[PDB]
Design a protein around this ligand. Structure first.
Ligand SMILES: O=C(O)CCCC[C@@H]1SC[C@@H]2NC(=O)N[C@@H]21
Ligand SMILES: O=C(O)CCCC[C@@H]1SC[C@@H]2NC(=O)N[C@@H]21
Lengths: 126, 127
């Protein structure tokens, strides 16, 4: 039901300590739909490309507060030659807003490609 | 022209095992090296799903160093609205005889008041 989300640059911390900041811009073509921009700071132990902002991009559907966004792990600080996409939904029914996602992370190990699966639960950082 | 270059050269059509079609457009990222913003349209043909047979915008990001991509569709247009969204992530495999885009996907949706996220996999080949 959520215009504070749509109007701001809100912040979301996951169970690994990473932080997602989202910005929404109305789609020129799709109703109730928004272009997602912002940045992602990865703090997940055992991963690369930690501690610096990476741009994120995706799409958000305001009808039932569902989102899908992606980061390519390439910036001025570090390049992990990989990308992640998250897809899930927001739940504002509790005293703390939560984002529940599943993610895939495509990467290479030498010449071998792979896609790792996982789940990120974020809570809003008011 | 190498297969990773044909991809960027203009618009390409990629077709998955369900008969769905992804049309990718690339333009250079404003801030990230070796990265492209992904735009285009997705026409769905998957059995047992909604929103079939019309174009939906797609958006995402592409890493050109090893041809890895992640893109999403919100299933809202002038024809149908499925109140859902899908994100695909994967890689372009140019090693075999024909190119395959290999992906995992997640589809977020509601069944009444219960939210869920469905997993699957799509392999896309050139048209
Ligand atoms: O190691 C890499 O290839 C780049 C960084 C990966 C970070 C992953 S993305 C999914 C999961 N959620 C996080 O916040 N961090 C990890
Ligand atoms: O039924 C819906 O909620 C909207 C259409 C979903 C189509 C899914 S997205 C993943 C998979 N790949 C396809 O090409 N079609 C299905």
């Amino acid at each position: 039901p959520d215009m504070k989300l749509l109007a701001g640059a809100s912040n979301w911390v996951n169970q690994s300590g990473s932080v997602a900041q989202f910005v929404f811009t109305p789609s020129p073509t799709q109703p109730q739909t928004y272009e997602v921009s912002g940045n992602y700071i990865n703090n997940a132990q055992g991963t690369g490309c930690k501690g610096t902002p990476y741009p994120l991009s995706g799409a958000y559907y305001s009808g039932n507060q569902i989102i899908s966004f992606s980061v390519v792990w390439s910036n001025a600080s570090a390049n992990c030659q990989s990308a992640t996409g998250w897809t899930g939904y927001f739940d504002f029914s509790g005293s703390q807003a939560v984002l529940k996602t599943d993610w895939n992370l495509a990467f290479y190990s030498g010449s071998t490609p792979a896609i790792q699966q996982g789940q990120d639960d974020f809570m809003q950082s008011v």
